[PDB]
Amino acid sequence: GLEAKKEENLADWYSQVITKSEMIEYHDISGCYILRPWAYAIWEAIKDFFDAEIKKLGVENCYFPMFVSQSALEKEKTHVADFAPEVAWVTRSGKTELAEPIAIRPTSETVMYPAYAKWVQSHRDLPIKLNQWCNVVRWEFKHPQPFLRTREFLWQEGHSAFATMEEAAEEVLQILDLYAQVYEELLAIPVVKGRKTEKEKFAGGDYTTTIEAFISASGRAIQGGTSHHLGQNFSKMFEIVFEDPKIPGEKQFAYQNSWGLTTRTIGVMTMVHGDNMGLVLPPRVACVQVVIIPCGITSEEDKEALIAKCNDYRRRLLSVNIRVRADLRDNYSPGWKFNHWELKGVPIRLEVGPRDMKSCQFVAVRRDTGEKLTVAENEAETKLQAILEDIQVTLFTRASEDLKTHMVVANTMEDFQKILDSGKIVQIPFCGEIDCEDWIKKTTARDQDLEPGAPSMGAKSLCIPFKPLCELQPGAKCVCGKNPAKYYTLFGRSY
Amino acid sequence: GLEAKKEENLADWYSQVITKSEMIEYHDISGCYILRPWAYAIWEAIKDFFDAEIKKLGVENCYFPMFVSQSALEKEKTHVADFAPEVAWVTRSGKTELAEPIAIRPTSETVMYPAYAKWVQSHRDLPIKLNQWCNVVRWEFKHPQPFLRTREFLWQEGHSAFATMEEAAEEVLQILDLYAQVYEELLAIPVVKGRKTEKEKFAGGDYTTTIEAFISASGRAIQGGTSHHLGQNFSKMFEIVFEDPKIPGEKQFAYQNSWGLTTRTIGVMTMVHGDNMGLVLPPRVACVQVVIIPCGITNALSEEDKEALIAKCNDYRRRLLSVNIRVRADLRDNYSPGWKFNHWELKGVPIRLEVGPRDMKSCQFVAVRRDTGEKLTVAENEAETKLQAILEDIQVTLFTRASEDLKTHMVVANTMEDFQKILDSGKIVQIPFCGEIDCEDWIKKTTASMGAKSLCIPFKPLCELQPGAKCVCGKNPAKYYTLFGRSY
Numbered sequence: 001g002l003e004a005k006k007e008e009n010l011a012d013w014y015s016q017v018i019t020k021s022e023m024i025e026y027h028d029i030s031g032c033y034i035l036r037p038w039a040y041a042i043w044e045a046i047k048d049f050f051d052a053e054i055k056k057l058g059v060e061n062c063y064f065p066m067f068v069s070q071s072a073l074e075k076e077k078t079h080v081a082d083f084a085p086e087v088a089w090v091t092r093s094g095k096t097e098l099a100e101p102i103a104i105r106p107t108s109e110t111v112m113y114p115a116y117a118k119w120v121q122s123h124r125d126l127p128i129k130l131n132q133w134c135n136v137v138r139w140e141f142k143h144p145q146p147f148l149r150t151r152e153f154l155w156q157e158g159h160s161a162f163a164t165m166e167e168a169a170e171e172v173l174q175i176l177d178l179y180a181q182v183y184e185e186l187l188a189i190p191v192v193k194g195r196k197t198e199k200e201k202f203a204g205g206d207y208t209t210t211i212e213a214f215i216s217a218s219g220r221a222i223q224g225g226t227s228h229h230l231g232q233n234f235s236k237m238f239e240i241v242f243e244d245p246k247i248p249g250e251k252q253f254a255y256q257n258s259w260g261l262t263t264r265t266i267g268v269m270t271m272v273h274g275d276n277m278g279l280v281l282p283p284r285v286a287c288v289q290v291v292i293i294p295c296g297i298t299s300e301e302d303k304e305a306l307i308a309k310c311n312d313y314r315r316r317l318l319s320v321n322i323r324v325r326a327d328l329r330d331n332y333s334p335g336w337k338f339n340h341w342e343l344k345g346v347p348i349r350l351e352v353g354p355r356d357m358k359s360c361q362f363v364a365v366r367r368d369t370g371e372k373l374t375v376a377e378n379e380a381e382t383k384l385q386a387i388l389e390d391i392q393v394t395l396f397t398r399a400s401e402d403l404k405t406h407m408v409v410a411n412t413m414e415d416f417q418k419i420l421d422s423g424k425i426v427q428i429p430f431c432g433e434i435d436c437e438d439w440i441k442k443t444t445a446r447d448q449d450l451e452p453g454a455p456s457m458g459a460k461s462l463c464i465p466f467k468p469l470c471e472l473q474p475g476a477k478c479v480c481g482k483n484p485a486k487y488y489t490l491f492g493r494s495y
Numbered sequence: 496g497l498e499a500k501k502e503e504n505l506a507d508w509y510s511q512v513i514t515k516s517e518m519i520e521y522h523d524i525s526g527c528y529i530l531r532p533w534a535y536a537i538w539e540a541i542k543d544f545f546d547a548e549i550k551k552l553g554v555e556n557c558y559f560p561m562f563v564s565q566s567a568l569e570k571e572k573t574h575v576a577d578f579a580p581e582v583a584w585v586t587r588s589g590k591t592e593l594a595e596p597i598a599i600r601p602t603s604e605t606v607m608y609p610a611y612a613k614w615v616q617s618h619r620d621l622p623i624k625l626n627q628w629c630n631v632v633r634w635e636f637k638h639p640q641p642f643l644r645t646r647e648f649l650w651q652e653g654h655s656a657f658a659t660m661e662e663a664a665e666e667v668l669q670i671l672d673l674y675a676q677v678y679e680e681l682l683a684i685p686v687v688k689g690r691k692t693e694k695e696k697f698a699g700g701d702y703t704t705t706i707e708a709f710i711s712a713s714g715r716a717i718q719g720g721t722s723h724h725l726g727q728n729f730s731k732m733f734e735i736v737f738e739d740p741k742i743p744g745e746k747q748f749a750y751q752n753s754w755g756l757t758t759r760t761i762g763v764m765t766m767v768h769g770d771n772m773g774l775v776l777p778p779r780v781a782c783v784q785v786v787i788i789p790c791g792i793t794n795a796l797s798e799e800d801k802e803a804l805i806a807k808c809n810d811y812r813r814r815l816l817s818v819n820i821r822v823r824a825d826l827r828d829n830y831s832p833g834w835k836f837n838h839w840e841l842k843g844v845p846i847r848l849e850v851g852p853r854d855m856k857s858c859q860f861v862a863v864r865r866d867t868g869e870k871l872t873v874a875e876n877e878a879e880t881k882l883q884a885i886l887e888d889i890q891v892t893l894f895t896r897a898s899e900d901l902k903t904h905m906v907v908a909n910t911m912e913d914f915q916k917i918l919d920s921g922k923i924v925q926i927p928f929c930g931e932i933d934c935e936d937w938i939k940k941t942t943a944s945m946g947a948k949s950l951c952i953p954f955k956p957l958c959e960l961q962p963g964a965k966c967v968c969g970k971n972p973a974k975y976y977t978l979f980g981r982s983y
């Protein structure tokens with residue numbers, strides 16, 4: 001049974017939920033977590049969708065080494081200046097010192113782009129569109145959080161190289177739209193699409209696009225995924241050059257993107273939809289969508305028939321592409337099974353007892369609302385499908401409502417401060433400068449009016465939304481007062 | 496095309512094939528290699544099959560950390576002694592030296608089994624059946640070789656814990672049989688199932704089962720996959736215990752297996768089926784089974800005819816997709832037909848489907864099998880039936896050829912001079928063997944090129960060991976026929 005309450009101690013609730021749902025186990029090293037099957041299956045559902053979608057775009061999967069040489073790691077100055085403090089270094093094998101230290105990838109731009117340089121000789125060798133599913137290591141000494149912010153994590157990183165800026169620009173937004181589909185259609189989490197500010201953009205990149213999710217339980221926002229246009233910044237450093245004989249002699253540098261998505265998805269899903277009974281799985285990613293549990297059973301051969309009827313429902317659901325398990329163990333009581341599968345967030349519990357079997361009916365119990373329904377055996381495939389779809393809509397609708405009551409506009413620093421301290425994220429007119437962003441962080445921390453159990457921190461930028469709530473009026477001032485605003489920018493306390 | 500010849504410098508042939516088929520690229524860290532999409536797709540076909548099969552056995556996928564602490568790594572002393580010289584160690588982040596060095600997994604027993612000990616708190620928590628698809632590092636300084644022997648490689652590693660030895664022993668063999676299915680049904684590679692000798696078995700395990708494949712062109716054998724029974728060696732160290740259901744208070748240690756299969760699969764496929772034209776893909780793992788190539792698109796051909804040709808190609812494409820044939824239509828106009836013939840030949844695509852304007856106007860096409868190079872003219876209306884047949888025949892042919900090779904090069908010998916002769920003729924030999932470690936080192940020393948090593952004790956030997964037969968050492972009696980050879 002779950003006893004930690006989400007609105008009381010969020011961090012302890014989160015830890016109880018991810019362990020009792022059998023999603024996470026703690027490793028004997030700090031910041032290292034084990035993905036047990038219940039969580040890994042969500043990642044695999046995400047993988048299946050995104051893999052199919054990028055393959056439609058011409059992207060192919062591959063696998064590049066996990067190690068970088070010091071020489072390659074340092075060829076793009078901005079990139080390495082940003083990643084160097086958290087790059088983990090292998091310096092020996094057994095007791096034998098290595099030829100030279102080699103680094104574990106924090107990201108694979110510097111692993112992959114020397115090979116791209118070899119592969120690009122003429123204009124027809126482009127585009128190059130590669131993806132890999134792998135682990136990366138970002139060894140920060142700040143406090144880790146399972147799924148949300150870890151030293152090692154699973155992800156996918158896509159890397160594409162084009163002869164023209166137009167093709168690259170097109171791909172950046174296509175990928176970002178796929179990440180939005182992952183969050184909104186699979187995980188039932190609404191997100192805000194936008195551009196990262198100058199301060200927050202990928203070091204070494206031209207510009208970074210992003211999707212941002214809002215976690216109302218902490219009132220904080222978090223980046224769900226990211227799609228960068230790298231311009232020619234890496235092609236010039238790694239010599240990814242072609243010669244088009246229609247532009248004789250002139251070396252031409254490829255235009256590049258990289259884009260990434262991680263198992264942070266599963267953490268956001270946990271934080272958004274979880275409740276005080278435990279995890280709540282959107283049916284689109286649930287490892288088990290329907291769990292069948294036999295009740296009653298306090299007369300043999302009926303008990304033998306009851307088990308048979310549970311397996312009948314199981315086969316009927318398997319036949320219609322509903323993912324189903326029959327918890328037929330006798331080693332545990334029906335109540336223990338109810339609790340076990342509620343903790344795990346199974347969308348529907350299918351209860352079968354003797355009376356209902358002899359009456360050609362069953363009971364379906366929805367996990368999002370607890371609502372109980374009696375269904376005729378004949379309708380099992382239809383109604384369950386309906387309920388599954390309805391659950392997915394409900395989860396999304398609720399999450400959407402929370403986002404829209406918690407994201408509002410403010411046009412002055414004082415209104416921004418007050419709204420922010422009330423637990424919301426705010427679209428403000430913004431001049432765009434890094435220095436002004438720093439000042440916003442510092443002063444929104446300095447001026448914070450604390451609300452009970454609210455996070456103590458300054459506001460950061462989240463994204464410049466593609467579709468802001470309001471149109472920037474002509475000659476509007478930034479909240480800094482001294483510069484004209486360039487755009488509405490979403491700000492909030494964030495992970 | 497391809498210039499280096501397989502029967503000459505095998506290593507240069509191998510290098511040329513793996514790069515010109517766009518399977519491998521060299522990384523700037525000597526000894527590490529890039530798996531380009533042509534190779535990765537083979538790995539993905541193998542994963543699709545194996546994943547489905549083990550999920551039928553109750554096994555579930557997970558992901559454990561890449562890092563091991565010094566204390567967990569050394570708890571099973573045999574295992575750590577075997578792996579310690581090739582464990583890679585992280586000693587700093589940025590410029591900050593780490594407080595304690597952390598190891599990268601060479602294999603995940605010592606990462607997973609503390610968690611297993613936490614998860615088993617009664618007999619009902621068993622069995623535990625977990626698998627992960629991931630990368631491991633074994634940083635030897637020997638000479639690496641793409642696919643076959645690398646410092647970093649992708650694999651799958653399965654780890655199961657049971658209450659009784661009978662369950663564990665059953666799973667060891669089920670997994671070994673799936674590995675043999677990967678090699679024989681998917682990769683068209685015959686293998687020999689057997690048991691490793693005491694000398695060659697997994698350090699810290701009780702016994703190791705294996706499949707061994709034979710590479711005609713080198714005379715050498717290579718281990719394809721392995722399935723180990725760890726017994727209670729690891730559960731005694733990591734305290735994986737449950738209470739006896741019948742005896743109150745009595746704790747019992749779980750029985751464990753682990754089993755692994757790597758991208759070495761691809762290397763063996765390349766070495767067994769490749770020829771002097773390049774890679775040769777078995778249809779069951781070929782990303783592209785049929786490639787459609789328009790020919791004859793000269794300057795004289797009308798726009799009417801050229802667009803009709805392209806549409807004919809797309810219609811073959813649709814038809815082959817409708818019958819589940821993995822087909823690529825290569826309609827690019829900025830590459831010549833000959834370039835495409837060569838490109839897809841080097842990549843080992845099973846069938847090239849040629850359509851020119853005259854063939855379209857004759858309601859037929861040309862299909863060229865990669866393995867034999869035979870050109871067949873096929874009527875349009877039979878495309879789906881014939882190509883399917885040919886794909887099956889290709890898979891059968893590749894297996895039959897390789898099986899003939901194995902039968903040719905795996906013979907029995909009962910004397911040591913006979914063993915030495917057959918071994919230096921480029922074969923592997925089943926010999927009467929006493930099993931002793933010292934005598935295995937002795938065979939290695941005497942047979943040295945290099946000395947032969949133990950490969951497997953075959954489940955099904957070629958000969959019944961005649962009662963009272965003496966080992967090849969001529970000192971102690973033989974316990975079993977053992978396969979020996981020069982090994983990868």
Ligand SMILES: Cc1cc(N2CC[C@@](C#N)(C3CC3)C2=O)cc(NC(=O)Cc2ccccc2)n1
Nearest residue numbers: 138140142143144148149150151225226260262
């Ligand atoms: C789980 C996860 C996710 C992500 N990040 C990053 C942005 C991104 C997005 N979008 C990446 C592009 C894909 C993302 O998901 C980042 C991380 N660790 C870290 O920063 C390192 C660390 C470790 C412990 C504590 C604090 C920091 N850990």
Ligand SMILES: Cc1cc(N2CC[C@@](C#N)(C3CC3)C2=O)cc(NC(=O)Cc2ccccc2)n1
Nearest residue numbers: 633635637639644645646648719720721755757
């Ligand atoms: C690609 C691959 C495969 C395998 N091994 C092992 C046995 C096994 C089987 N069966 C594994 C249990 C599954 C296998 O495939 C082993 C390896 N590297 C190494 O030993 C490290 C190395 C590196 C350079 C030179 C020499 C040695 N590299």
Ligand code: PRO
Nearest residue numbers: 107157226258259260
């Ligand atoms: O780390 C990043 O954000 C980019 C996207 C994936 C690859 N590198």
Ligand code: PRO
Nearest residue numbers: 602652721753754755
């Ligand atoms: O390395 C090995 O041989 C065993 C089997 C896979 C995991 N550990």
Ligand SMILES: [Ca+2]
Nearest residue numbers: 037038041287
């Ligand atoms: Ca599962």
Ligand SMILES: [Ca+2]
Nearest residue numbers: 082083084086
């Ligand atoms: Ca950093």
Ligand SMILES: [Ca+2]
Nearest residue numbers: 205206207231
């Ligand atoms: Ca620009």
Ligand SMILES: [Ca+2]
Nearest residue numbers: 248249250251
């Ligand atoms: Ca110029």
Ligand SMILES: [Ca+2]
Nearest residue numbers: 449450451452
């Ligand atoms: Ca207050």
Ligand SMILES: [Ca+2]
Nearest residue numbers: 532533536782
């Ligand atoms: Ca491919």
Ligand SMILES: [Ca+2]
Nearest residue numbers: 576577578580
């Ligand atoms: Ca060793």
Ligand SMILES: [Ca+2]
Nearest residue numbers: 744745746747
């Ligand atoms: Ca005792």
Ligand SMILES: [Ca+2]
Nearest residue numbers: 856857858859
């Ligand atoms: Ca004809």
Ligand SMILES: [Cl-]
Nearest residue numbers: 687688954955
């Ligand atoms: Cl056998």
Ligand SMILES: [Zn+2]
Nearest residue numbers: 431436478480
């Ligand atoms: Zn400003």
Ligand SMILES: [Zn+2]
Nearest residue numbers: 929934966968
């Ligand atoms: Zn002997």
